[PDB]
Predict the structure of Nucleocapsid.
Amino acid sequence: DFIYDDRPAAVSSTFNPEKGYMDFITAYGKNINADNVRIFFLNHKKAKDSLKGSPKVEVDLQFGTLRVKVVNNHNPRNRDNPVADNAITLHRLSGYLAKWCFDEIDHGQIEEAEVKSKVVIPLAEAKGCKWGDGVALYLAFAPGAEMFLKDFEFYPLAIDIQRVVKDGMDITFMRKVLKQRYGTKTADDWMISEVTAIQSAVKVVAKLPWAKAGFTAAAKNFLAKFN
Amino acid sequence: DFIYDDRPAAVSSTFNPEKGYMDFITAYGKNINADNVRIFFLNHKKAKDSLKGSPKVEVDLQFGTLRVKVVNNHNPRNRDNPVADNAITLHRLSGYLAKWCFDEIDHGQIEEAEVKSKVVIPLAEAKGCKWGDGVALYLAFAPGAEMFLKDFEFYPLAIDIQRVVKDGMDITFMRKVLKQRYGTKTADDWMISEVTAIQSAVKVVAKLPWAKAGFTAAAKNFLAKFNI
Amino acid sequence: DFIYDDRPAAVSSTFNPEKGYMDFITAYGKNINADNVRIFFLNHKKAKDSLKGSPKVEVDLQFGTLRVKVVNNHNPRNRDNPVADNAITLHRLSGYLAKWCFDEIDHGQIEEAEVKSKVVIPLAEAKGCKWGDGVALYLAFAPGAEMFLKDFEFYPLAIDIQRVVKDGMDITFMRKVLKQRYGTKTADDWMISEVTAIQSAVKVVAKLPWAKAGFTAAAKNFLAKFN
Amino acid sequence: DFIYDDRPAAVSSTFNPEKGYMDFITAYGKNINADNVRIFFLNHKKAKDSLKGSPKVEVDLQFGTLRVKVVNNHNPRNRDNPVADNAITLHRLSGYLAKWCFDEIDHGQIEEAEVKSKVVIPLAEAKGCKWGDGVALYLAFAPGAEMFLKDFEFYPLAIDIQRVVKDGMDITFMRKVLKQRYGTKTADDWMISEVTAIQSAVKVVAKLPWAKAGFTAAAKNFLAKFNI
RNA sequence: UUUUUUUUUUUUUUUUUUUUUUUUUUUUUUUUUUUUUUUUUUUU
């Protein structure tokens, strides 16, 4: 009576990031602008702890002009609460807005210019990557980019790999990306089929500063006078 | 100001898992089914933390329709409370239900299918073991299985060994398992007598994927292409 | 106003464990017996955490029939409060009672029998040391024994060293023992003078079960590996 | 429905440690004496935990005769609050009092005697540094000293580098310092210009015991005879 | 030259570690999903 537990059932996954993205756009597309994409991408972690502190399972948030209805599972008890396929987590939202940046870029040159001039990703910065390095590569640092592997040319995967080898990141964080699809190909398929594109991606990512989150170029060229 | 201290004394162990199990069945057997057992095996860890939080000495819990009166020794101070041989801790509860699944499978075909299709052991999966691998083996991953070394065909021991050698497990954990009995044969006895069976078990456990639970080969084989 | 702070100044210690022990015997010696001592050594950690919980500076404790007026500096805020040389902390109490057992054994064989048949020190045990191995050695595992390095034949020091090499003990715990005296010799002296006797002690402790904390090898295992 | 969020957009470097110091002295210079500076430096960490506990956005503190209006930003939730340049953080306060000591010593023989005989900086001692080793050097161990790289002859920098090299300190703690000025020289400037002075400082700091304090040789030596 | 996270004198000082025994107890390891969660977060 003091503590009661109850059963979750097994299932397979009916969640298509493409569809979730489209429904998300149809639902919120009027309040999305490069300004909000930018405050969010600067407010991801802040929102991470902000959700972490609060105990409500279904919180709505405001980034500037953007209103978002998000599921909160950062809070401990909620880590196993269910999440609808039309629902949005900060991870899913992040991926979605990254996707938005990617399409918006292709829409034309004025479109190409605005976001590029106004979009920087802290996670990408901390490793010293900027837009000039590549579009797919640069946007791939956004969490949730793993949902759109093709558009980002296997770069989120490669980045995760580099995190494992150089930053000794715990291997479990590759769990999510290793379930994800490459177009029509299931994980099991592309894990053997597409090794080439992946290795190429790894190379591409390798040729990057990878500064320590991050030291302006004066560092770490000065700290290699003392070692 | 006062704090309050006195002597605990030494004795031998009068706890028979076979019988303890029998009283557990006699007492709770009407609400034990594959459903509730499955709910237990999925909520072991959660309930463990929930017991860690509370300082109550004797907590009651409900897994689906099954209610059990459990002794709490996960709360730090409570780690030294006495435990009756007719009392139940989660470890004992797990072992008991592991044994229950083990018997129920032999009860017949419907029961075998019910248990096999429902019951899930997180620890076994996390190492890539499934029901198809074996009943004794798959169930041996359940905590408390060490209390029934015979029925689980010495497998929990083999698993523990496999854990120390590749996962660098702290050896201290083998303390419980290394005193456990083989049916009636004593630890000191079976520890040289049945060496063959043990070795066979170790070999069986040896051939398994044994990746981290989240992914298993060829997820494992794909990392290999870059990093083990 | 909100919190304020103030000075402490210090250079020296006037604290002689011999004198402290003698005063302790004079004050409490009628209530000291193998029963109470034994209860103490089994409830040391318990009382220690119980003191960690309480914020009171000077707590009363009862071990069997023995009541003690002990100083509490286990509470974080209290960790830098002063300690009189005639005062008693759980560490001082433990060391004192270790000394007491050591003397009581010499009083005759019957007293030796009460202490040996009753008193048990968990830390000595966890390493597989028993009374049969030696009195000085067995008692040396008791916290506070470092105050009487002479009587315990350098064994607490050797034990601390072995904790560092085999158990990866953080070296900081040896700070205390390395300031202690060996009878009349100060630290600076015996650290060079008694190196031989110390090494002998180390060899003794070394040839002990240890191997490892948490285990008794009733039967050996054709392990792939040990430890 | 609402967890209010909004944007800060920026990158400006107002804060001038010289000016901050001058305002701080103008405000408090009369209540600063060797006594209070000493008690402060002895109560730095305590004040740090005590403020971590508190919810005040701006806490008030008393060190001996000195009362100060300090900004509290060690508190998790408070960790993103703004900080005025005429305001004082406990880091800033520490650096400021270090500078104070540096000026006061030069005031004369008697003042030098008060400061040298009273003020002790635990971090400097913990590495075996004493007043006799140097004034700038000894004072450089004080947190916030990185604000006055000129006065302390690049010693806070050298000490930090040395923390990374000898104590494997996470390199991120070298952030600040690597933003600070050397008198007029910008970091981008002095990082190339004053390399000579830098390494000299580095060597000076290298020529120190730098053992846990903690221990003194013989002891390091006594340990060496078994372990490091 | 934001802010914070670590590092804190000197004592025969004080704290932080290690804590017998048992078919005892506790400490470790916890499924599957295009699920969710834990790490990595610009610029002074």
About this structure: Strands of chain A lie at 3-5, 58-63, 66-71.
